[PDB]
């Protein structure tokens, strides 16, 4: 209600080669976040931007390692952002975070963050 | 080193001062805050609101920055600000400024965790 909350769902355990969809709906903000995106932190690695998109569905950017396999979308509700992940690889294992209010894939520019959803891709 | 958030406070925050007319304010403050040291900073805005109230703008209306970046935030209320602008005779190292008081919405770019102002973008 009074708090902005980025509610993440989907994700979880999946076999290599498989697919998952992550979803995030922001509640508590009365206007439109210009950019929303997905970030991840893999075991042994720093946090990195995975995909981001502006409220018009444009400015779309992907990490090079997921281009052609992951698809971001914002056409399914106000301040909602989805990540369809296909052909999943063990190295996609990570905590995935939704973020809102920043610019492109630069994590320092985002001020609202989901609490994080585990994605585990087993070999 | 000075953090990005502290540089914003040095360049743009003057919470203790009121909006009283003060024709030399910018000449005094642009020098005191080190904004004339390497060159004459051409335009600079000081904000006469509390640091808490200015930090809170990072949770207010998300808007585009002037340069096209999208991590800017506009205050819902207008705020007591002072615009400092170089005069026609200003030339480094002899910088000179005109002072203009205004009440306008501020727009800041925010970064970090905690998410705080690191750049003063515009007033409207």
Domain ranges for chain A, please list them: 1-123
Which structural technique was applied?
X-ray
Number of domains in chain B: 1
**A85 contacts: CB under 8 Å, gap ≥ 6:** A19, A20, A21, A22, A66, A69, A70, A92, A119
Return the CATH number at B7: 3.10.130.10
Q: Read out DSSP for chain B?
A: ---HHHHHHHHHB-TTS-S---TTHHHHHHHHTTSSSSS--SEEEEE-S-HHHHHGGGGSEEE--TTS-S-EEE-SS-EEEEEEEE-TT-BTTB--EEEEEEEE-EEEEEETTTTEEEEEEEE-
Separation in Å, CA of A98 to nearest CA in chain B: 15
CB contact under 8 A, B62 and A32: yes
Q: Are residues A6 and A114 in contact, defined by beta-carbon separation less than 8 angstroms?
A: yes
What residue ranges in A1-123 does DSSP mark as E strands?
5-10, 12-15, 20-27, 35-41, 48-54, 61-62, 70-73, 80-85, 94-100, 112-113, 117-122
Choose the closest CB to B112 out of A31, A35, A108. Answer: A108
Is B43 annotated in a binding site? The answer is yes
CB pairs under 8 A between A and B: 34
Domain that holds residue B122: 1-124
Within 10 A of A18 (CB to CB), how many other CB atoms are there? 13
Burial of A76 (0-12, 13-18, 19+ CB in 10 A): exposed
Q: What class is the A1-123 domain?
A: mainly beta
Of the candidates A15, A22, A17, A21, the residue with the CA atom closest to the CA atom of residue A116? A22
Q: Which are the contacts of B98, defined by CB distance < 8 A and separation ≥ 6? A: B26, B84, B85, B86, B87
Resolution stated for this PDB structure, in Å: 1.6
The number of angstroms, rounded, from the C-alpha of A98 to the middle of its chain's C-alpha atoms is 4
């Amino acid at each position: 209600g009074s708090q902005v909350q980025l509610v993440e769902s989907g994700g979880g355990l999946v076999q290599a080669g498989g697919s998952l969809r992550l979803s995030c709906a922001a509640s508590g903000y009365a206007y439109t976040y210009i950019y929303m995106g997905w970030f991840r932190q893999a075991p042994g690695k720093e946090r990195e931007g995975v995909a981001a998109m502006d409220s018009g569905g444009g400015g779309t950017l992907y990490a090079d390692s997921v281009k052609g396999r992951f698809t971001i979308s914002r056409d399914k509700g106000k301040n909602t952002v989805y990540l369809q992940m296909d052909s999943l690889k063990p190295e996609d294992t990570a905590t995935y975070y939704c973020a809102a209010g920043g610019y492109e894939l630069r994590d320092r520019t985002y001020g609202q963050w989901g609490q994080g959803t585990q994605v585990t891709v087993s070999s | 080193k000075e953090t990005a958030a502290a540089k914003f406070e040095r360049q743009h925050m003057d919470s203790s001062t009121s909006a009283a007319s003060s024709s030399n304010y910018c000449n005094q403050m642009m020098k005191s805050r080190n904004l004339t040291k390497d060159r004459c900073k051409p335009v600079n805005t000081f904000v006469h609101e509390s640091l808490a109230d200015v930090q809170a703008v990072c949770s207010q209306k998300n808007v585009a920055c002037k340069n096209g970046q999208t991590n800017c935030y506009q205050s819902y209320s207008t705020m007591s600000i002072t615009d400092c602008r170089e005069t026609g005779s200003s030339k480094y190292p002899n910088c000179a400024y005109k002072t203009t008081q205004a009440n306008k919405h501020i727009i800041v770019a925010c970064e970090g965790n905690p998410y705080v102002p690191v750049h003063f973008d515009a007033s409207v």
